Amino acid sequence: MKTQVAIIGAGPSGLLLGQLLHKAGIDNVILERQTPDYVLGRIRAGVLEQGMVDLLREAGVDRRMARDGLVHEGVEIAFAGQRRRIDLKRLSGGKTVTVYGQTEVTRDLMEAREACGATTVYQAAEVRLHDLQGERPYVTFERDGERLRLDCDYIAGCDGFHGISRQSIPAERLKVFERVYPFGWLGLLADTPPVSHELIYANHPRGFALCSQRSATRSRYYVQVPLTEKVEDWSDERFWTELKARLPAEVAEKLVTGPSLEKSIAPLRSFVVEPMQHGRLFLAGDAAHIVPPTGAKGLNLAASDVSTLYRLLLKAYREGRGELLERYSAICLRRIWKAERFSWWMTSVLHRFPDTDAFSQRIQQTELEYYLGSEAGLATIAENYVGLPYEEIE
Amino acid sequence: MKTQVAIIGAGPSGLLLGQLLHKAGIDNVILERQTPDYVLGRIRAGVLEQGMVDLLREAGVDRRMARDGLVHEGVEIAFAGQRRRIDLKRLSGGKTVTVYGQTEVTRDLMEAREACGATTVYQAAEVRLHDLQGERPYVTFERDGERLRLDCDYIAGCDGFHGISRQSIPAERLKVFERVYPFGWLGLLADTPPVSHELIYANHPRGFALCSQRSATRSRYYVQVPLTEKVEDWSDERFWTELKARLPAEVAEKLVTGPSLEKSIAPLRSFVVEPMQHGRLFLAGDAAHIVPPTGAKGLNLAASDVSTLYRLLLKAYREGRGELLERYSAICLRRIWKAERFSWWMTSVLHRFPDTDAFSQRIQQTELEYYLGSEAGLATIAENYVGLPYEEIE
Numbered sequence: 115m116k117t118q119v120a121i122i123g124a125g126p127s128g129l130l131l132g133q134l135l136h137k138a139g140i141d142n143v144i145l146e147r148q149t150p151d152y153v154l155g156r157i158r159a160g161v162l163e164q165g166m167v168d169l170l171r172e173a174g175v176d177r178r179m180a181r182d183g184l185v186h187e188g189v190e191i192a193f194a195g196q197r198r199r200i201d202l203k204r205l206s207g208g209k210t211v212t213v214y215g216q217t218e219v220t221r222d223l224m225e226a227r228e229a230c231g232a233t234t235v236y237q238a239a240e241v242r243l244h245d246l247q248g249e250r251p252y253v254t255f256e257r258d259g260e261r262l263r264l265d266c267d268y269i270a271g272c273d274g275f276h277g278i279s280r281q282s283i284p285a286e287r288l289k290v291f292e293r294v295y296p297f298g299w300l301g302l303l304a305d306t307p308p309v310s311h312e313l314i315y316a317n318h319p320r321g322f323a324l325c326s327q328r329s330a331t332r333s334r335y336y337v338q339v340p341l342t343e344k345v346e347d348w349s350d351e352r353f354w355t356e357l358k359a360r361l362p363a364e365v366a367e368k369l370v371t372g373p374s375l376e377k378s379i380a381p382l383r384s385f386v387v388e389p390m391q392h393g394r395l396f397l398a399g400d401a402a403h404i405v406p407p408t409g410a411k412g413l414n415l416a417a418s419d420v421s422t423l424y425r426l427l428l429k430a431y432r433e434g435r436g437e438l439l440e441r442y443s444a445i446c447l448r449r450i451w452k453a454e455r456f457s458w459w460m461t462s463v464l465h466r467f468p469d470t471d472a473f474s475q476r477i478q479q480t481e482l483e484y485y486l487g488s489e490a491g492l493a494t495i496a497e498n499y500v501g502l503p504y505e506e507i508e
Numbered sequence: 509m510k511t512q513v514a515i516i517g518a519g520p521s522g523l524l525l526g527q528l529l530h531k532a533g534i535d536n537v538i539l540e541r542q543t544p545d546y547v548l549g550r551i552r553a554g555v556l557e558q559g560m561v562d563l564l565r566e567a568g569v570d571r572r573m574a575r576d577g578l579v580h581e582g583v584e585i586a587f588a589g590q591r592r593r594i595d596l597k598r599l600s601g602g603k604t605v606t607v608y609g610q611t612e613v614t615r616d617l618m619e620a621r622e623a624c625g626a627t628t629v630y631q632a633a634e635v636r637l638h639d640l641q642g643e644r645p646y647v648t649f650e651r652d653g654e655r656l657r658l659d660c661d662y663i664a665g666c667d668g669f670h671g672i673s674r675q676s677i678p679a680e681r682l683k684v685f686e687r688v689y690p691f692g693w694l695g696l697l698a699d700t701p702p703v704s705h706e707l708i709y710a711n712h713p714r715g716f717a718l719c720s721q722r723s724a725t726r727s728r729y730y731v732q733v734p735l736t737e738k739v740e741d742w743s744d745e746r747f748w749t750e751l752k753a754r755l756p757a758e759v760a761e762k763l764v765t766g767p768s769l770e771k772s773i774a775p776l777r778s779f780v781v782e783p784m785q786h787g788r789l790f791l792a793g794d795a796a797h798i799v800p801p802t803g804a805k806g807l808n809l810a811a812s813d814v815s816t817l818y819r820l821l822l823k824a825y826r827e828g829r830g831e832l833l834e835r836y837s838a839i840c841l842r843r844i845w846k847a848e849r850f851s852w853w854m855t856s857v858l859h860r861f862p863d864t865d866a867f868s869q870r871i872q873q874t875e876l877e878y879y880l881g882s883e884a885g886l887a888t889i890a891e892n893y894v895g896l897p898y899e900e901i902e
């Protein structure tokens with residue numbers, strides 16, 4: 115087969131770019147390993163910064179999110195004493211965030227893609243990339259025994275962390291940087307029970323807790339836990355009792371529990387490859403970098419790069435030129451780092467590491483006091499939470 | 509002898525409080541171990557935040573510093589690329605800092621104290637504190653064989669890090685917190701040569717460098733160096749060549765060298781005792797806490813506590829009451845920590861630690877980019893550099 119851009123990866127990155135390109139007139143084919151269920155059972159993110167919203171806007175998840183997603187103007191951060199509110203809008207120069215839900219923005223892209231007639235080879239095992247640095251790359255997947263060959267012009271890796279694009283890049287051509295943090299996150303998606311209205315972030319000595327939403331009668335909760343320590347060991351009841359355990363007056367008559375919408379899980383780290391490019395391969399999303407879940411970045415990360423991948427593709431196709439397309443990893447790496455940074459700070463002011471000496475934790479307490487206190491303090495939080503500015507081009 | 513407040517320590521803390529108290533009418537006696545030379549050969553600080561200036565103001569080092577001290581409205585921070593200016597006044601809400609010089613503010617207090625007739629027992633060996641928790645404390649020093657006894661009402665420890673007040677506090681009554689950083693600072697006070705006009709802070713990969721002033725034809729330079737690595741090993745010429753080595757276009761035709769005004773030295777760490785109190789003992793300054801030299805805090809630290817020590821003493825003496833004097837370690841510990849914090853951040857964004865993985869240094873670079881870039885970023889720097897607000901009371 116022949117298409118322009120061949121996408122390995124039907125997660126949201128893969129879909130947006132596909133679902134961006136299509137609208138412009140640059141035929142793409144999504145190449146996905148799994149079934150349209152398994153990707154849809156994947157319950158992750160809830161927070162999308164604007165720009166990834168405007169992006170969705172500049173395509174399609176207008177209808178349903180304009181319709182169904184809580185737009186939020188603040189967060190709260192509690193830290194042994196009390197709850198402290200941020201007011202993102204008046205701190206951020208006037209921006210905010212929407213809690214739509216990852217698995218939803220994903221079902222809409224599979225929705226809208228389905229009706230355009232744009233190609234998507236699901237259950238495609240053995241994907242392989244051939245001819246990267248070449249003038250005509252080609253991708254190869256098995257749909258039987260039936261080894262097929264798709265010649266494209268450009269291959270965009272939206273494979274995710276455990277993808278095959280990244281590895282298919284001559285290692286000496288790459289530069290990794292990564293921190294595997296010592297604790298995972300235990301999620302608990304429950305729906306019957308109503309939430310506590312804004313996001314509550316928490317620095318309790320038993321570890322970190324996080325009350326979140328998906329709907330107005332749908333909750334998303336997490337509590338920091340050590341590694342590989344089994345979930346088969348957690349419980350609804352054992353969850354409800356520990357979450358409760360790390361909160362204030364938000365936690366009792368106020369909180370309502372229930373059995374978990376059979377969603378419960380794990381893990382976190384920071385990782386980044388440099389460069390995000392090879393010949394005609396382009397990594398996007400989790401293929402390229404990994405940021406701790408704590409600053410609601412990652413999907414928001416993948417949107418901002420899927421953005422450059424696409425505008426850079428317009429000019430290639432539509433204008434004449436695009437070696438500008440070499441300047442991609444350049445634009446994207448700027449933002450990935452201020453974002454990686456924002457992510458670790460959050461990670462480390464809120465989390466409880468096995469180590470601290472009364473200085474490190476003395477330091478840890480004081481920085482919260484300072485940032486949650488100073489207006490200059492607070493605006494550094496706000497500014498990064500909603501999203502730093504986006505990007506250059508030309 | 510009998511006096512009100514007995515001060516162990518003639519450094520600036522000891523002198524200010526003494527030299528504050530006197531003016532109010534609360535007789536004090538300074539008790540110092542060394543000679544008035546050795547304390548005066550002690551060349552340290554150059555930067556004093558306002559408030560410690562206003563304090564000096566509210567006593568005496570008006571004349572000479574109103575006269576001789578460069579008032580500064582900004583600093584510059586360089587970090588492989590270029591120099592970046594801060595503009596403390598327009599970032600700080602309108603404040604600034606004066607580079608007077610520690611050893612000077614010290615000679616003025618010995619100046620002014622000398623003419624009031626206020627007591628100062630120099631060369632007083634064997635100082636010892638007796639009766640802390642008692643209703644009438646007493647201090648004991650040897651001026652011969654001649655063991656003397658000074659009964660006071662209150663003993664204020666302005667002894668410095670290596671003093672005798674702190675140790676004379678029932679250890680289980682105290683709580684220490686400290687970080688011994690892995691590098692010292694090599695100072696080089698030269699005077700014949702003019703400076704480079706504002707302060708230049710530097711993050712160069714060979715370690716940190718610091719160009720500073722004392723006069724308009726007097727310089728103060730430092731370069732980070734590993735520990736106990738001998739100064740007998742440094743040189744003027746070997747200094748001039750390494751400083752130069754960690755700078756930009758500020759460093760050549762621009763910099764002028766010379767032999768060092770025989771001033772060359774070492775070391776740094778963070779340390780804090782909690783509480784800063786015992787019965788009728790009060791620690792002030794380096795006796796109580798130690799902050800890395802890098803955010804020009806320490807003397808500025810000691811001023812802000814010498815301040816509470818003194819106002820708290822007014823009300824005891826002059827009003828009627830002062831159990832308010834129990835609430836001292838309370839006021840002072842607030843500020844010492846936001847200041848300890850500000851000090852480590854500075855220490856760690858500018859210094860080059862033996863460790864960093866391309867993430868820690870990737871993180872290190874990005875945070876500078878972020879703070880030196882963001883306006884909210886910049887104002888968090890400014891606000892802390894000039895001095896956080898001061899304090900409550902009543």
Ligand SMILES: Cc1cc2nc3c(=O)[nH]c(=O)nc-3n(C[C@H](O)[C@H](O)[C@H](O)COP(=O)(O)OP(=O)(O)OC[C@H]3O[C@@H](n4cnc5c(N)ncnc54)[C@H](O)[C@@H]3O)c2cc1C
Binds near residue numbers: 399
């Ligand atoms: C607990 C948690 C909470 C988070 N919360 C937030 C939040 O609130 N806000 C926010 O903005 N971000 C959040 N994130 C980030 C978010 O998880 C991701 O950054 C986002 O899903 C990016 O996904 P992705 O496109 O790279 O790929 P993925 O979601 O991994 O999708 C990759 C796709 O590639 C396919 N694939 C894999 N290998 C192959 C192959 N060899 N061939 C073909 N196809 C293949 C997979 O089947 C999958 O469909 C959170 C993360 C976690 C873990």
Ligand SMILES: Cc1cc2nc3c(=O)[nH]c(=O)nc-3n(C[C@H](O)[C@H](O)[C@H](O)COP(=O)(O)OP(=O)(O)OC[C@H]3O[C@@H](n4cnc5c(N)ncnc54)[C@H](O)[C@@H]3O)c2cc1C
Binds near residue numbers: 516
């Ligand atoms: C390289 C460097 C640069 C610095 N730069 C700055 C800067 O730019 N700005 C800033 O604000 N701060 C700066 N600081 C901080 C500054 O050094 C101190 O915080 C400040 O001098 C506080 O001094 P202190 O009063 O506690 O005591 P000290 O200076 O130690 O004086 C203590 C006094 O007590 C006496 N004493 C000791 N033991 C006894 C005893 N048993 N009995 C009686 N007397 C005794 C000593 O003889 C001495 O006179 C810097 C520090 C360093 C190391």
